[PDB]
Amino acid sequence: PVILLKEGTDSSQGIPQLVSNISACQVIAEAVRTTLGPRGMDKLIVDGRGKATISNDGATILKLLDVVHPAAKTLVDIAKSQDAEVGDGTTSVTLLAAEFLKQVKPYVEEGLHPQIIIRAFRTATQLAVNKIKEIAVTVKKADKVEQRKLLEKCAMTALSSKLISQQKAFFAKMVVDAVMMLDDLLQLKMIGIKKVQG
Amino acid sequence: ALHVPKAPGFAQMLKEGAKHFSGLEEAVYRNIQACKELAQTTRTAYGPNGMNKMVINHLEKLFVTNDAATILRELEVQHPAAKMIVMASHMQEQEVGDGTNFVLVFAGALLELAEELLRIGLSVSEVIEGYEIACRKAHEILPNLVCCSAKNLRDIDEVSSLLRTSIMSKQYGNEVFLAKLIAQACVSIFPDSGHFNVDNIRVCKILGSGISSSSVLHGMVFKKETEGDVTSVKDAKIAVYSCPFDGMITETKGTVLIKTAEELMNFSKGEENLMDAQVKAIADTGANVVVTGGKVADMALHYANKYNIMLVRLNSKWDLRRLCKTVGATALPRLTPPVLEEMGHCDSVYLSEVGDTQVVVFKHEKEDGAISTIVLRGSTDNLMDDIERAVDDGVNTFKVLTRDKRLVPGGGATEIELAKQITSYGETCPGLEQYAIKKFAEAFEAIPRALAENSGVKANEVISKLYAVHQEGNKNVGLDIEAEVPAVKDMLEAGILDTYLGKYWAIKLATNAAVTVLRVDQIIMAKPA
Amino acid sequence: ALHVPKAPGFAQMLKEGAKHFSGLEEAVYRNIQACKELAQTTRTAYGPNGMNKMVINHLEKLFVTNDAATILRELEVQHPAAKMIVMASHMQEQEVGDGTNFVLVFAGALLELAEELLRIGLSVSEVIEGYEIACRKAHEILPNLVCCSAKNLRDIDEVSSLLRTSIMSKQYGNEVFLAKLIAQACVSIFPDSGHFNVDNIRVCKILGSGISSSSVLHGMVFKKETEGDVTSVKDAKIAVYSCPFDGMITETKGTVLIKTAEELMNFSKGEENLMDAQVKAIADTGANVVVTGGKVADMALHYANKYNIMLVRLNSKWDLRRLCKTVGATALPRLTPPVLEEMGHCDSVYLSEVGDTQVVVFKHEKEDGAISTIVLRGSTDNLMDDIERAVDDGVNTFKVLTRDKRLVPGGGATEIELAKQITSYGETCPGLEQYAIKKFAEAFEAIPRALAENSGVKANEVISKLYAVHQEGNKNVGLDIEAEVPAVKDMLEAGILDTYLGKYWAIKLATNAAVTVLRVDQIIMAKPA
Amino acid sequence: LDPMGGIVMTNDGNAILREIQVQHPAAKSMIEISRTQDEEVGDGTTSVIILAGEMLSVAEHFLEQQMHPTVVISAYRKALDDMISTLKKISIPVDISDSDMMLNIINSSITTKAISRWSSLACNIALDAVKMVQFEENGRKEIDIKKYA
Amino acid sequence: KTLNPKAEVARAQAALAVNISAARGLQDVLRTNLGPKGTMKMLVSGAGDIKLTKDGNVLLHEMQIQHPTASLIAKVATAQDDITGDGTTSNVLIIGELLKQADLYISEGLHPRIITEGFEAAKEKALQFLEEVKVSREMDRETLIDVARTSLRTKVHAELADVLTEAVVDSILAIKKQDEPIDLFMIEIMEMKHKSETDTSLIRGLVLDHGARHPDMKKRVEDAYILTCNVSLEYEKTEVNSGFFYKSAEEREKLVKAERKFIEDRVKKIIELKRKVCGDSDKGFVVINQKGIDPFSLDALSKEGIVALRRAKRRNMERLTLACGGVALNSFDDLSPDCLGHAGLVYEYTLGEEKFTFIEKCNNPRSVTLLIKGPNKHTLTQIKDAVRDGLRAVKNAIDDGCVVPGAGAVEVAMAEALIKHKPSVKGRAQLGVQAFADALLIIPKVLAQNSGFDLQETLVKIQAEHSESGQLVGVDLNTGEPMVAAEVGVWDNYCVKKQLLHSCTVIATNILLVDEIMRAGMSSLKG
Numbered sequence A: 001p002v003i004l005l006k007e008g009t010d011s012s013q014g015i016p017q018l019v020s021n022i023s024a025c026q027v028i029a030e031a032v033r034t035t036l037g038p039r040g041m042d043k044l045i046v047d048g049r050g051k052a053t054i055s056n057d058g059a060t061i062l063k064l065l066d067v068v069h070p071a072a073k074t075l076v077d078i079a080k081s082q083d084a085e086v087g088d089g090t091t092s093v094t095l096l097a098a099e100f101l102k103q104v105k106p107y108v109e110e111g112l113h114p115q116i117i118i119r120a121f122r123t124a125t126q127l128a129v130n131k132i133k134e135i136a137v138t139v140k141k142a143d144k145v146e147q148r149k150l151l152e153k154c155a156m157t158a159l160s161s162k163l164i165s166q167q168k169a170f171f172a173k174m175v176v177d178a179v180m181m182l183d184d185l186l187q188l189k190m191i192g193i194k195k196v197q198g
Numbered sequence B, C: 001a002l003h004v005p006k007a008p009g010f011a012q013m014l015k016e017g018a019k020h021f022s023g024l025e026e027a028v029y030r031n032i033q034a035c036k037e038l039a040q041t042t043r044t045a046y047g048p049n050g051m052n053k054m055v056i057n058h059l060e061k062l063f064v065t066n067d068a069a070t071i072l073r074e075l076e077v078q079h080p081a082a083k084m085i086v087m088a089s090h091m092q093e094q095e096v097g098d099g100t101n102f103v104l105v106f107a108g109a110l111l112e113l114a115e116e117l118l119r120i121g122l123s124v125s126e127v128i129e130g131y132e133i134a135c136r137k138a139h140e141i142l143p144n145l146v147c148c149s150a151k152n153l154r155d156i157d158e159v160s161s162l163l164r165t166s167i168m169s170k171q172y173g174n175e176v177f178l179a180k181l182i183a184q185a186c187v188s189i190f191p192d193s194g195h196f197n198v199d200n201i202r203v204c205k206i207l208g209s210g211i212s213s214s215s216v217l218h219g220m221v222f223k224k225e226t227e228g229d230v231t232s233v234k235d236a237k238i239a240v241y242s243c244p245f246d247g248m249i250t251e252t253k254g255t256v257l258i259k260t261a262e263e264l265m266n267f268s269k270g271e272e273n274l275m276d277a278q279v280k281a282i283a284d285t286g287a288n289v290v291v292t293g294g295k296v297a298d299m300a301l302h303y304a305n306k307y308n309i310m311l312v313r314l315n316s317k318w319d320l321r322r323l324c325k326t327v328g329a330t331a332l333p334r335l336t337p338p339v340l341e342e343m344g345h346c347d348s349v350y351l352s353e354v355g356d357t358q359v360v361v362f363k364h365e366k367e368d369g370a371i372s373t374i375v376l377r378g379s380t381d382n383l384m385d386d387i388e389r390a391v392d393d394g395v396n397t398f399k400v401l402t403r404d405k406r407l408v409p410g411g412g413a414t415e416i417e418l419a420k421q422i423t424s425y426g427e428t429c430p431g432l433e434q435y436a437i438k439k440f441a442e443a444f445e446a447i448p449r450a451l452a453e454n455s456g457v458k459a460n461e462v463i464s465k466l467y468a469v470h471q472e473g474n475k476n477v478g479l480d481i482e483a484e485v486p487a488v489k490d491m492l493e494a495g496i497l498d499t500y501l502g503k504y505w506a507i508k509l510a511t512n513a514a515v516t517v518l519r520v521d522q523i524i525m526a527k528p529a
Numbered sequence D: 001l002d003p004m005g006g007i008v009m010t011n012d013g014n015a016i017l018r019e020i021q022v023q024h025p026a027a028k029s030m031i032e033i034s035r036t037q038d039e040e041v042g043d044g045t046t047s048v049i050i051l052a053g054e055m056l057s058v059a060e061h062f063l064e065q066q067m068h069p070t071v072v073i074s075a076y077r078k079a080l081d082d083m084i085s086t087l088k089k090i091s092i093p094v095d096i097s098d099s100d101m102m103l104n105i106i107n108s109s110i111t112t113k114a115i116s117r118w119s120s121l122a123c124n125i126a127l128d129a130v131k132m133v134q135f136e137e138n139g140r141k142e143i144d145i146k147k148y149a
Numbered sequence E: 001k002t003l004n005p006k007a008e009v010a011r012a013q014a015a016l017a018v019n020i021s022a023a024r025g026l027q028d029v030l031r032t033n034l035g036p037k038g039t040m041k042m043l044v045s046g047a048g049d050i051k052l053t054k055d056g057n058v059l060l061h062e063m064q065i066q067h068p069t070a071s072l073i074a075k076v077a078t079a080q081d082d083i084t085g086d087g088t089t090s091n092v093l094i095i096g097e098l099l100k101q102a103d104l105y106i107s108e109g110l111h112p113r114i115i116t117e118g119f120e121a122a123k124e125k126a127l128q129f130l131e132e133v134k135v136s137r138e139m140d141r142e143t144l145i146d147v148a149r150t151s152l153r154t155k156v157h158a159e160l161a162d163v164l165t166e167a168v169v170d171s172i173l174a175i176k177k178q179d180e181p182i183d184l185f186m187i188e189i190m191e192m193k194h195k196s197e198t199d200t201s202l203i204r205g206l207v208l209d210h211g212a213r214h215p216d217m218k219k220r221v222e223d224a225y226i227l228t229c230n231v232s233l234e235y236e237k238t239e240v241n242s243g244f245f246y247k248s249a250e251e252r253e254k255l256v257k258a259e260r261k262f263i264e265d266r267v268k269k270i271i272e273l274k275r276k277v278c279g280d281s282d283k284g285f286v287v288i289n290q291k292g293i294d295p296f297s298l299d300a301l302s303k304e305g306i307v308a309l310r311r312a313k314r315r316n317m318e319r320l321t322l323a324c325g326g327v328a329l330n331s332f333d334d335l336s337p338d339c340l341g342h343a344g345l346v347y348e349y350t351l352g353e354e355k356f357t358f359i360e361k362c363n364n365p366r367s368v369t370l371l372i373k374g375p376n377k378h379t380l381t382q383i384k385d386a387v388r389d390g391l392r393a394v395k396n397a398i399d400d401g402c403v404v405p406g407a408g409a410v411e412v413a414m415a416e417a418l419i420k421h422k423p424s425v426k427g428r429a430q431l432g433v434q435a436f437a438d439a440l441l442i443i444p445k446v447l448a449q450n451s452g453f454d455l456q457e458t459l460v461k462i463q464a465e466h467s468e469s470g471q472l473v474g475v476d477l478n479t480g481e482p483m484v485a486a487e488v489g490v491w492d493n494y495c496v497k498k499q500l501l502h503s504c505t506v507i508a509t510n511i512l513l514v515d516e517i518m519r520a521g522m523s524s525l526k527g
């Protein structure tokens, strides 16, 4: 007789679909697993035209991967959001999400309500945010050179697991003087980046 | 072997590619089975405890929503029996906006309970008459179960307490903040003498932090930039011009004719002088920012930047009218200085950025005003779309409550009471319509059963306890949610209230779709193109 | 475009590959046209002036003859009416052997006339009745036209003058010598008390000169050679043996069982002694030539050549019986020497070679004998086959004349007289059969018209002259062939005689075929395989 | 219409089901149980299929109410036991020496087939065949084979 | 459809319409063969064989139609043909007319059960009328002659029909006994392709399909004896595997001469028996053997003047014993002269390649042989079929002690009885009785249409002449005027018509109860 939906529509249940989604998300964590600590390395992506793309940041690696899975696209979205917000820990969020999924996989396979798991995740996130805001340890009044020293230390820490790790003490003062002379609204488009061969 | 021929009459002239289903088995039963299979798909996503669904269309997109309307729209069904239910759901969403899955479940239950009647012997006419009588009885008894009305509509401590039930069913967990935001947005745009518009709420999706970082804005926002160098403007006098900020020419194709050298030397000089004079005359009225809606020029931009005039360029043929209605100004089709009654008084016009995205914020310090804009913050497009859909559903519920301030006890007590009243009324009805009345009364038990199945408890025990409570004397007692043990809970003390006119229209449309499907006899199709 | 369907019934259940012809236009008229087209092929080859036809079959063979029987047999026609006509012609050839093209032309004319008889409005039953009445009348007045008879059947100068008319129709020009040879061969094999056999005439084809070198033989010939060294024997006695000239053995599988040096040395000696004793006992009975029909051995051949015994080996079964019946001896199933009754009565046995072909001639000095052989000469195989067919036709005509000595005038006078008598008798018959009788009378004019067309002159003038001659008072006057002008000539003075029984049987078979074809109005065929 | 080329025109429940080619395992199991019922008693081939279909159709109402199939099978067995007990209790005896009663029983059993107009002789034919088939050999064994008729 | 997508199934209305269309087509196709004034059909097979027949069974079997209802109709026609004799076209005609009359009332809104009950009641009434209207006769020579003439008039013309009638009557009278049913398988039907068809006569004896083999044998014997046997006269080998072992040529020759001694004893015994029976050169001796004869035995028999025939059929052993009166012995144990037969004229005939053997002039023969002659094969087949139909009709008329008039007066009387009987039946069976009565009147309608006259006017005139009179007013085929059927010479049969009506009623009951033609078989498309 006449069919209901269109001929060629894939369907799934619940528990097997969630298991497959967890197994697919566990593979994305292995792509940004080595690029993390200072002793980590980088990857090399080749497109269909023959151009090499070498980048240690996980955002570029996830963008150049071109994933077609509907469940694996959640990591790329949060990675792009983190890169647009502050632009720092792009792989730590993915690693934490993969660890949470691997931890809740047995709890899901045993037979637990997803609403309870979502509520527990929300409560744990709120508690962690409150604890971090409590032990934030901020200052109110510092010296003129103390702010520059803190900026240099933050720059050296952020440029520790990068390619220019051997010259992290030279670019710190440069970026400090560049940001300090950026008016008050902090216009990132006003900084010119030139690349000269040699 | 031996091959049988065709029927010498109508089967031979039926033409290949088409189909024919004249019998009741290959038509009515097939449509009933198709409707049952369609209802068995979107059944687990009904109550607040139901899960979401990720549907992908043929455009290689992503739609992870929870409402049944979006699921039915992004499905592409090739069956008329389900197409009728899809059209009914679309009509219900266009009318009210909060009663699609309920209509689908009611229609599926009615068809499932009428299939057995048609099998045992009840014809289509008697079943249709009994269903119509039961629907009329339910529509007559429905206004007798109100006992709840809305007091004020502009109180922020009362509007957020009514839409919380509708918001929790779509977004379980984070509902108080969304309800407060919707109430504030509705209060900031509430005019006078009623007349609430649905296009006065603008939603903006900005990829930022979490959900708690979102806030409301008393004004409008645009994801553009500033053409000039003027940014921070205190007392801004907006002068919107519908014409493009350039030199006006003739509509008919015409060139300039020059002969002597004096004209060739003075043409550009006179043009620049006239442009400077027009720029000085425009800025002489006190305008601080000019919002155009077309192509700009270099000389005009330079003359505006020389006199410190902010230029905002945008083309959408709707945002300009929205800004004009918000600031209270009129559009001018020519480059003429406006009058005092055609000025756009604002409060603060600046250019900032949030979430690595430059946006122009038109915040006003007035508590009232015209329209507002809700800014959304998140990390995924699906979550932002779900939040926008929840905000739209809350706005529709607020509009329905403003149109009709009558409330009914939500949860599942109203359906149980209606079924009990229909069963009690149908007991004294002689003839053969008593079976149809009792079957229509049994269709109301599909909502508590689905709620118990989505929660994770026994549906039979919950239904029995609800029936016992209704027979004892209590009428506003539904099914508890925050309890793993199948028990009961009061709906009036908790605050589970839903609209009455919306449910009435949903029941009416469900009955109409049911009788329309039952009225279909044979099916005659053709070949796909 | 609109496609017309089929008739729900026999048209739909007709199955593929099959046909149907219900109307008279697609059945009777089609068969009439097919028979007319078939008769128009062999119409130019009828009388003595008819040309030959080069027919090539699927076996890559040449057939350049003049008889219509071989042509009809070598056509392979896929038509039912044509197949029935061919079967009727074959039956006429088997019964008589001298009337096929005449029957074909008669049937074609009858069908062509019945076509217009059914077209004008007459039915089939009346036409069939009129045709039967006309055939009965023609058969009744047929014996009343006898004007000649055969006196003696053993005279050479009398038999050769009767078959000359039939031979001249096949071989125009050189026919007197062939007629004389046929008469001599029939006289030399004619016994007593009638009873003439048709299988007592042998035909030997030897390539050499032309038809002038042909001669008859009072015996038999074989295309073999002499196995032994004996050339020719004068007074020899033939000893026919059906068993092979070798030592007889057991039919059951059995081997010899020798012992020591005695039997191993005596077996071959005893076998040779027995063979020599048998050879001596065979030749001691006065025999000189031994004719066997099986495989011979080397020792037996050597022992026969030692005692001067001619050995003739042949493998043809019927040839052995013919040679036994020619010499009067019989056959023997075992190696038994004759005494005095199973001897041989020959005359001269010699081996000659004519035309690079060694043949054994068994000449007999007796003028009578049993069978004979007509040695034919020629340069081509087609001419030899045509001469053999003409000899067979002459033998068949002689047999028919011996069966019935009633002679009737040939040419084109008997048919004209019969047509005139039928036309004169049909004028006194009422009803609707008069038209059928008049049409049957007009069908007899297809023979004089064809003869005049084949001769090379007009036909209407010849027909009118023949009718005027018949109306004047003459009866045995027909058309002329040697005359270049359309004139008439006496048939009794020239010597044009034909068989009456043969023509009667031909007319009967033609009428039977006509009434059988004119009785089927619908044909039901299937698919070829 | 069998694939051989013949014509099967009958009204029995087993002769029609055996000439239908299917692919679902449930249909194969139904054909198997119908053939076993036809080979066991001989009569009642359609009623068993109809009852099984009805029992499987009325069983889907409980499967959608999160009910375990073990309780369903237990209730089915308990109902089968009660039905067997009721059928054994409402059993009515009958004498085998009465020929009129046997003829009436045979006529009521064959009143559905196309011999409704000729059962006046087919009943006596079947009675004589049954009387002639029964044979007692040695011992206390009374067999009634059908390979001799 | 849900379980087998490659299966074609029809409902009730579609199947009924298909069956009605098939019946109407089969009725319109086989409608020009009823009566002697019908048309002749020509059938051509796939190999190119022309067949000119007029029987309904052969025409239906050779029509190339693939349909279940058509196959059932063909099977019923073949059963009627090989059980009774003549009654194939009328069966299909009545079946189609009854199906049309039933569909005429079913399409208006009726039940098939009431129609079946009415048809059964009408069939019972017609059977009672036929049993109460049949007249008893003694069946003399003129009655059988008239029956055979009426049966053969619808095959050939007039002369051939009368010749075949006389031949069949003579053969039946010759094979007629004093008691017991008429046993068939006695009249040999031999076909010869020579002369014409008007030379058909009956030979009082047996005509064989083979003659002698030895050329030195007698061809015409004025007085000879008939010896029927089936012993083997060839070199037969032992069952156990044996073997010969000699030493020299003399031992081999002795073994060869001794191995052919078993048949020599039988040859000597036959020679001694012939010499004891005959003696002088005045009588002959014919040996009829069923197996082959060795050439040595043939030569030994021809040396004394014995004509032996080898390789004969098994059916000729009974015909010769019934005609001559010999003894078909198997062994040569008690070779008595009383176990021989008497002949009168033993002569052969040569027809080109084949050979025949005619045994004429018998004392009291009981198994004759019909000689058939024809110029073509289709004519011979048609004459043989007509002779078989005439013999079957004569046997059916002899086995029954009643005669039924032909033409169409019986159908008119049955229709009148059914019209007078419907008001006496309760329920809605009156419509079924009327339909059965209108369907039985299709024989005179076809008989009058093929002649060339009207149908409705002829039926009205026949009914008016039959209602005012009390005789069996038949339908004439010459002038169209109503004439008497049981007075001129038109006759038929009773059991044949009864079986035809029973088959028609059974077919109608089976068709009116079937409304589902499901086809769920294996397509067999593997590989």
Ligand SMILES: Nc1ncnc2c1ncn2[C@@H]1O[C@H](COP(=O)(O)OP(=O)(O)O)[C@@H](O)[C@H]1O
Pocket (backbone or CB within 6 Å): B045, B046, B047, B048, B097, B098, B099, B100, B101, B102, B165, B166, B168, B169, B170, B410, B411, B412, B447, B479, B481, B496
């Ligand atoms: N807090 C709650 N407790 C119990 N039931 C609820 C609650 N909130 C909503 N519901 C149920 O959810 C149903 C509506 O859910 P939803 O699918 O969001 O809208 P719709 O009415 O369009 O189906 C109502 O019938 C109501 O009974």
Ligand SMILES: Nc1ncnc2c1ncn2[C@@H]1O[C@H](COP(=O)(O)OP(=O)(O)O)[C@@H](O)[C@H]1O
Pocket (backbone or CB within 6 Å): C046, C047, C048, C098, C099, C100, C101, C102, C165, C166, C168, C169, C170, C410, C411, C412, C481, C496
């Ligand atoms: N010498 C002749 N003179 C006149 N007519 C002749 C002569 N020879 C043959 N014919 C005519 O030619 C016709 C053809 O004869 P023939 O070819 O021998 O056999 P068929 O008649 O079968 O063709 C005969 O009908 C005969 O009348």
Ligand SMILES: Nc1ncnc2c1ncn2[C@@H]1O[C@H](COP(=O)(O)OP(=O)(O)O)[C@@H](O)[C@H]1O
Pocket (backbone or CB within 6 Å): E033, E034, E035, E036, E086, E087, E088, E089, E090, E150, E151, E153, E154, E406, E407, E408, E443, E447, E475, E476, E477, E490
């Ligand atoms: N000479 C005749 N006179 C009157 N009726 C005839 C005559 N010959 C045949 N009929 C009728 O024609 C009908 C058809 O006969 P026929 O075709 O020979 O066999 P069947 O009855 O089997 O079709 C018969 O019922 C018979 O009554």
Ligand SMILES: [Mg+2]
Pocket (backbone or CB within 6 Å): A087, A088, A089, A090
């Ligand atoms: Mg980092």
Ligand SMILES: [Mg+2]
Pocket (backbone or CB within 6 Å): B098, B099, B166, B169, B170
């Ligand atoms: Mg909702």
Ligand SMILES: [Mg+2]
Pocket (backbone or CB within 6 Å): C097, C098, C099, C100, C169
């Ligand atoms: Mg000739």
Ligand SMILES: [Mg+2]
Pocket (backbone or CB within 6 Å): D043, D044, D109, D112
């Ligand atoms: Mg039964």
Ligand SMILES: [Mg+2]
Pocket (backbone or CB within 6 Å): E086, E087, E151, E154
């Ligand atoms: Mg007949």
